[PDB]
Design an enzyme around this catalytic site. Structure first.
Site, PDB file in Angstrom:
ATOM      1  N   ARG A  66      -1.031  -1.317  -6.520  1.00  0.00           N
ATOM      2  CA  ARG A  66      -2.017  -1.540  -7.548  1.00  0.00           C
ATOM      3  C   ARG A  66      -1.755  -0.718  -8.824  1.00  0.00           C
ATOM      4  O   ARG A  66      -1.669  -1.276  -9.908  1.00  0.00           O
ATOM      5  CB  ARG A  66      -3.413  -1.276  -7.018  1.00  0.00           C
ATOM      6  CG  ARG A  66      -4.411  -1.081  -8.134  1.00  0.00           C
ATOM      7  CD  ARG A  66      -5.800  -1.016  -7.554  1.00  0.00           C
ATOM      8  NE  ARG A  66      -6.035   0.275  -6.920  1.00  0.00           N
ATOM      9  CZ  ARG A  66      -7.238   0.779  -6.643  1.00  0.00           C
ATOM     10  NH1 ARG A  66      -8.336   0.099  -6.869  1.00  0.00           N
ATOM     11  NH2 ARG A  66      -7.331   1.967  -6.090  1.00  0.00           N
ATOM     12  N   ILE A 107       1.232   6.241   4.626  1.00  0.00           N
ATOM     13  CA  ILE A 107       1.577   5.633   5.917  1.00  0.00           C
ATOM     14  C   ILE A 107       2.595   4.472   5.742  1.00  0.00           C
ATOM     15  O   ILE A 107       3.605   4.434   6.450  1.00  0.00           O
ATOM     16  CB  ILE A 107       0.305   5.266   6.780  1.00  0.00           C
ATOM     17  CG1 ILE A 107      -0.455   6.535   7.184  1.00  0.00           C
ATOM     18  CG2 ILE A 107       0.687   4.481   8.009  1.00  0.00           C
ATOM     19  CD1 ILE A 107      -1.800   6.337   7.903  1.00  0.00           C
ATOM     20  N   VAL A 163      -6.126  -6.124  -4.685  1.00  0.00           N
ATOM     21  CA  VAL A 163      -6.689  -7.041  -3.681  1.00  0.00           C
ATOM     22  C   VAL A 163      -8.150  -7.364  -3.967  1.00  0.00           C
ATOM     23  O   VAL A 163      -8.748  -8.171  -3.283  1.00  0.00           O
ATOM     24  CB  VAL A 163      -6.505  -6.545  -2.220  1.00  0.00           C
ATOM     25  CG1 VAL A 163      -5.002  -6.487  -1.877  1.00  0.00           C
ATOM     26  CG2 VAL A 163      -7.162  -5.201  -2.021  1.00  0.00           C
ATOM     27  N   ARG A 188      -1.886  13.593   6.662  1.00  0.00           N
ATOM     28  CA  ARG A 188      -2.045  14.049   5.282  1.00  0.00           C
ATOM     29  C   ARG A 188      -1.440  13.067   4.299  1.00  0.00           C
ATOM     30  O   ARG A 188      -0.225  13.017   4.143  1.00  0.00           O
ATOM     31  CB  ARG A 188      -1.341  15.390   5.063  1.00  0.00           C
ATOM     32  CG  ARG A 188      -1.749  16.451   6.054  1.00  0.00           C
ATOM     33  CD  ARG A 188      -1.464  17.843   5.480  1.00  0.00           C
ATOM     34  NE  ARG A 188      -2.227  18.871   6.191  1.00  0.00           N
ATOM     35  CZ  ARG A 188      -3.479  19.227   5.897  1.00  0.00           C
ATOM     36  NH1 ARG A 188      -4.149  18.654   4.897  1.00  0.00           N
ATOM     37  NH2 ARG A 188      -4.071  20.181   6.606  1.00  0.00           N
ATOM     38  N   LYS A 216     -13.989  -0.108   8.521  1.00  0.00           N
ATOM     39  CA  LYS A 216     -13.018  -0.280   9.614  1.00  0.00           C
ATOM     40  C   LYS A 216     -13.485  -1.116  10.799  1.00  0.00           C
ATOM     41  O   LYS A 216     -12.678  -1.841  11.397  1.00  0.00           O
ATOM     42  CB  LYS A 216     -12.473   1.076  10.112  1.00  0.00           C
ATOM     43  CG  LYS A 216     -11.729   1.826   8.983  1.00  0.00           C
ATOM     44  CD  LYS A 216     -10.447   1.099   8.512  1.00  0.00           C
ATOM     45  CE  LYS A 216      -9.654   1.972   7.542  1.00  0.00           C
ATOM     46  NZ  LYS A 216      -8.464   1.239   7.037  1.00  0.00           N
ATOM     47  N   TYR A 266     -16.730  10.141   7.719  1.00  0.00           N
ATOM     48  CA  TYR A 266     -16.008   8.901   7.485  1.00  0.00           C
ATOM     49  C   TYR A 266     -16.922   7.805   6.921  1.00  0.00           C
ATOM     50  O   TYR A 266     -16.479   6.940   6.151  1.00  0.00           O
ATOM     51  CB  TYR A 266     -15.381   8.442   8.782  1.00  0.00           C
ATOM     52  CG  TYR A 266     -14.203   7.550   8.567  1.00  0.00           C
ATOM     53  CD1 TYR A 266     -13.236   7.873   7.633  1.00  0.00           C
ATOM     54  CD2 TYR A 266     -14.037   6.397   9.331  1.00  0.00           C
ATOM     55  CE1 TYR A 266     -12.158   7.047   7.443  1.00  0.00           C
ATOM     56  CE2 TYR A 266     -12.998   5.520   9.108  1.00  0.00           C
ATOM     57  CZ  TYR A 266     -12.041   5.866   8.184  1.00  0.00           C
ATOM     58  OH  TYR A 266     -10.937   5.051   8.015  1.00  0.00           O
ATOM     59  N   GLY A 279       0.732  -1.260   0.000  1.00  0.00           N
ATOM     60  CA  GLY A 279       0.000   0.000   0.000  1.00  0.00           C
ATOM     61  C   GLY A 279       0.764   1.314   0.000  1.00  0.00           C
ATOM     62  O   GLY A 279       0.214   2.323   0.432  1.00  0.00           O
ATOM     63  N   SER A 290       2.042   3.995  -8.677  1.00  0.00           N
ATOM     64  CA  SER A 290       2.637   3.574  -7.425  1.00  0.00           C
ATOM     65  C   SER A 290       3.967   2.798  -7.587  1.00  0.00           C
ATOM     66  O   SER A 290       4.881   2.982  -6.768  1.00  0.00           O
ATOM     67  CB  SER A 290       1.638   2.756  -6.615  1.00  0.00           C
ATOM     68  OG  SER A 290       0.469   3.513  -6.374  1.00  0.00           O
ATOM     69  N   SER A 343      -5.008   9.463  -0.003  1.00  0.00           N
ATOM     70  CA  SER A 343      -6.359   9.073   0.398  1.00  0.00           C
ATOM     71  C   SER A 343      -7.059  10.050   1.329  1.00  0.00           C
ATOM     72  O   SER A 343      -8.243  10.338   1.149  1.00  0.00           O
ATOM     73  CB  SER A 343      -6.370   7.654   0.993  1.00  0.00           C
ATOM     74  OG  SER A 343      -6.064   6.723  -0.043  1.00  0.00           O
TER      75      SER A 343
END
Ligand code: NAP
Ligand code: NAP
Ligand code: NAP
Ligand code: NAP
Ligand code: 5PP
Ligand code: 5PP
Ligand code: 5PP
Ligand code: 5PP
Ligand code: GLU
Ligand code: GLU
Lengths: 255, 254, 254, 254
Positions: free
Chosen positions: B38, B18, B65, B192, B162, B155, B11, B42, B195
């Site tokens: 993906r 992150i 995924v 920040r 989540k 969210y 990711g 990236s 996403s």
């Protein structure tokens, strides 16, 4: 609680042992008008016969497969045309393939995962959205969950994750629909012998563990879920939303 | 100290992801790393970011995924190229922009199930495939957010996804515990990233943390990485089924 | 790595104390350590245990946390002898044996308030005094049990003392966060210790973890120490008000 | 319907007491009530307020819950005057003003323990004495606040006392369950009462609830009473060790 002049929609009666039927007997005894929704033909047959123990003068029966947007949309539309505005909705609906209620959770297929999500969690969102059209001045929506949504529990597997989802779906709908005066809450029922329970791995050994270890040293029944449903669905609970009340003999509180 | 350890980081999109914070820390600590992506873009960002790392080989696999095949063949190919691994850092989520703002009750079925698919289900299959490469045990960590535990403005679909992920973590922990494979979550405070740019009200939240959270400051990706390094290593040997909040204390207050 | 860091470890009784599992781990990582004990039948004893560690010199202080004077003067002496510190490991609890079995409804006022005093309140006063020696920030860790979050058989009065402790951790975290002092708890699974002998049904519980926890085994003092090192160090810099379970996954199942 | 039921309500001070919301609802539903008080002034207020009730006779007992003998004798007297009871509503807490503001880490031993003794321990000994008047079972409900579950501003010593109460509730539940006595908490949102006038930032918290809580409004005492009626009656058979948040939904958001 006195519920005369209230109308509630009850989703998920399949037969006389459905939790939703314990809910119906409690609201029916308290004077509510009830409207029932079902998926299978057989469920509609069970309902037609179960109405006879009920004080309902008219059977209001609607086939809603909550996999179909159309059916949920047109279904609540028709309820509103037949019985006017409603005061809330008891949601008693979930589904997973057998495969996925035993053995290794790590072998869950994508397809059985999303199916459990779709029927057991997403369905509440679309129901909330359609029922809300029928509650222009407020009401109450209650869904049925299981302690497996809060802890990893043997066998419950894909349904545990769908209940975790449902339980958050409740909190998010409570925040969203709150300013509309629509409260949304879960009942976390303890294990009860129902059609659906007969497909869950290890159900009997859980039933017995409750009796032995839960503070009340006994299991609960559908009527007891009914009684808490009436509280939630009524003005008795007007200060309460986004909550999950365990009707499980205290088993949630101990380890 | 992670020399002779191998971790798969899933990711990284760019320097702000992150997972790139995780990567820097694990790289600094001596670990061999393998990366999955993906989008074409990236891999491009990845090839460039490796020049800042001490990885002497680039190990890059395209895994979307949403495809079982890609996850399955992905991990299988990792096994052939580097051998057995010691853990997986899951840093993957997605939801359509319209489902990250406005009224949750209006979420589409397809919106909902896409969020669940990519941000929760992906963990189950990754764990299944990654397992095959940890005959001796190992550690898997996912990335979650406090909106999985509470209703949080905007969210929306992702908070339900989540809540599913966090549960998925408990169930995998239980399942894989006998195989000595720990499964845990890090609940990062707002940071920040690409996403993050798509979530209504991100900026409001970011500044409320700064004002309200115990430590009165936001966290960064390197602080996530340092908690990942603990969770992926023997330091955390007795810990599984756990959600560590790396969020300046925000989760403990109200 | 913890060279040029200094920690106060409170609550070593004998070779089995969780606190001593913490010490071996911090010592092995090169920290300077300072020890506090309640009475003398740890003092002659603590001096023998330290021969194991690589502490070049013994810094040992008698503090019974039932006395403010001893907490206040104890920490003052520490600062004079050893200088500023980086953190505190709190490993202290107490209740009367009669309140650790039988019917919780039958607990005496005195027994209830003693467990509170020693097991919870002590962290508050220790944190207040310790802060004085941590002008540039630091880390405080207490030790809790799953019986602070659920009603568990026998643990009774100590379960309510731990619920209290775990809230104390949250409130200290908010209060001291702006001073850059993080406060956390480790929720250790069952471990054979001096204090464990006086807890009703302890062996039953220990055996059950092994049968039912995700990892199918018990944890030990050193596993507590490893997570303590994480929490005591910059690795956890963004974590405060947190309760980490070092318990083989047991908290996550039912 | 609660005719033929008798409930002891502890902690009315005046018309704004939460406990008086409870009493107006039980009295409305047919119950017989017995009231307990500490200050003479609370007795005066009780005699005034009883003119608004359907209660045909006053049943007032002075019980300071710091005294074992007053609790033991008070309930013993209650049994002799009204016979067996169906339940107790517990609506008692106390802390010194200095501990409801400023820095939690500055709390004194004596202030911490006072709050524990009155706000938590009192439930334990009230349960033990009231159990003697419930041979066929019944229901005990205590009043808590969100501050027992999260570190909230100012609430300080009382937040840790509520953590303690909420655990006290679970432990009483497990203990008294086999006797068919259910034990539960209501977590009330903030409501203008006498004791609320001593809590720091109470006004700003009230207004935040309206701005942020799902129902965008505050709750009142009667809404607590309604939930209390449910917890105290057969409607809630099955429910024990539970904490119902009567708070406009605020517990479930961040
Ligand atoms: N019994 C327990 O131990 C237990 C414990 C906690 C929670 N719960 C929850 O309680 C709820 C009720 O289940 P139950 O135990 O009472 O079993 P049940 O009687 O078998 O009820 C399940 C109901 O789900 C309905 N359903 C499933 N898929 C549907 C769909 N696609 N569209 C419309 N309806 C659908 C079924 O209707 P059709 O028959 O027409 O297909 C059936 O009426 C479920 O949410 C369950 O997870 C059960
Ligand atoms: N930033 C925050 O405030 C925050 C806070 C808490 C938790 N998190 C979580 O942290 C994780 C990382 O996100 P981030 O903030 O670091 O943003 P990011 O840089 O945008 O990383 C998100 C990653 O998800 C990947 N992804 C999405 N769909 C995928 C798919 N179908 N197959 C494979 N990869 C896919 C993306 O890869 P491609 O670009 O190649 O499509 C991208 O690398 C997520 O789980 C997020 O929910 C973020
Ligand atoms: N063992 C477990 O399975 C387990 C699990 C989870 C959490 N815990 C927690 O771990 C912590 C450490 O306990 P342990 O299991 O390691 O047992 P332990 O070795 O007996 O340690 C308890 C320590 O507390 C000290 N202490 C008691 N009262 C004190 C006072 N008034 N002032 C200063 N020190 C005092 C004892 O000192 P003295 O020797 O002078 O009496 C002893 O050193 C405790 O908080 C306990 O609740 C234990
Ligand atoms: N108001 C809120 O926003 C709020 C929110 C959540 C929870 N609560 C809780 O609700 C409960 C009732 O408080 P309240 O807000 O209604 O305030 P209140 O009317 O001032 O009641 C507090 C009661 O505690 C009693 N009390 C204190 N120490 C006692 C002792 N030693 N023995 C016997 N009684 C004692 C007082 O009696 P005397 O006056 O005779 O001393 C008084 O009746 C408390 O547990 C409080 O923590 C309140
Ligand atoms: C794990 C053993 C106890 C399970 C209790 C229980 C029983 C029936 C349940 O209802 C189901 C409906 C569809 C699929 C699976 C289950 C349930 O949710 C929960
Ligand atoms: C609600 C405002 C704070 C959001 C914090 C945050 C930011 C980015 C996040 O990452 C994604 C969000 C949506 C889609 C895909 C990934 C996140 O999960 C959580
Ligand atoms: C409930 C049985 C498992 C006990 C686990 C455990 C063991 C020792 C513990 O430490 C104690 C310290 C002083 C008094 C009582 C206990 C504990 O907290 C927790
Ligand atoms: C922190 C601001 C909201 C306070 C809500 C509230 C108000 C009154 C409360 O009752 C108290 C009784 C005695 C001492 C302290 C408080 C309370 O517990 C909780
Ligand atoms: N675990 C068995 C069920 C036996 C039981 O109910 O205890 C199964 O796979 O269905
Ligand atoms: N924070 C003030 C109360 C005034 C207010 O809430 O505006 C106090 O010290 O009690």
């Amino acid at each position: 609680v006195n519920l005369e002049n209230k109308t509630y929609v009850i989703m998920g009666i399949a037969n006389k042992r459905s939790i939703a039927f314990g809910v119906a007997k409690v609201l029916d005894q308290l004077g509510a008008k009830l409207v029932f929704t079902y998926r299978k033909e057989r469920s509609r047959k069970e309902l037609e016969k179960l109405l006879e123990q009920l004080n309902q003068p008219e059977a209001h029966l609607y086939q809603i497969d909550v996999q179909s947007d159309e059916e949920v949309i047109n279904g609540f539309e028709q309820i509103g045309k037949d019985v006017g505005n409603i005061d809330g909705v008891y949601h008693s609906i979930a589904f997973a393939n057998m495969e996925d209620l035993r053995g290794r959770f790590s072998e869950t297929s994508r397809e059985g995962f999303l199916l459990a999500q779709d029927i057991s969690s997403y369905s509440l969102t679309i129901v909330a959205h359609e029922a809300k059209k029928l509650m222009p001045e407020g009401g109450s929506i209650v869904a049925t969950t299981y302690l497996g949504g809060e802890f990893a529990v043997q066998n419950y597997n894909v349904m545990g994750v769908a209940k975790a989802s449902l339980e958050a779906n409740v909190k998010y709908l409570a925040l969203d629909l709150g300013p509309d005066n629509i409260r949304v809450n879960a009942i976390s029922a303890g294990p009860i012998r129902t059609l659906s329970a007969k497909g869950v791995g290890g159900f009997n050994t859980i039933l017995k563990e409750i009796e032995e270890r839960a503070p009340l040293k006994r299991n609960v029944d559908q009527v007891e879920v009914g009684k808490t449903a009436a509280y939630l669905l009524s003005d008795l609970s007007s200060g309460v939303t986004g909550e999950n009340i365990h009707v499980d003999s205290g088993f949630h509180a101990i380890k």
